[PDB]
Amino acid sequence: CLVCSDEASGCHYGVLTCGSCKVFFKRAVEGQHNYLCAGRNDCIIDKIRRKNCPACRYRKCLQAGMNLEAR
Ligand SMILES: [Zn+2]
Numbered sequence: 001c002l003v004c005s006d007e008a009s010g011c012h013y014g015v016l017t018c019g020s021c022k023v024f025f026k027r028a029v030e031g032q033h034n035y036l037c038a039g040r041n042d043c044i045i046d047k048i049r050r051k052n053c054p055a056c057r058y059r060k061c062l063q064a065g066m067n068l069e070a071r
Pocket residue numbers: 001002003004005006017018021
């Protein structure tokens with residue numbers, strides 16, 4: 001993961017965030033779109049690898065530069 005650092009794979013979504021955040025982005029993209037954090041001033045879904053905010057993960061998938069159809 002470009003973001004979290006939970007090893008990722010290239011695949012169809014290109015941008016190699018972990019498999020989950022990709023499929024996630026996908027279903028997100030699709031239904032639950034825009035995940036605007038806990039707006040808790042740039043929440044970390046990283047370093048320690050704890051999901052302090054699921055919303056924030058999508059936000060940083062963007063930030064990482066992860067978009068659905070292989071950005
Ligand atoms: Zn990830």
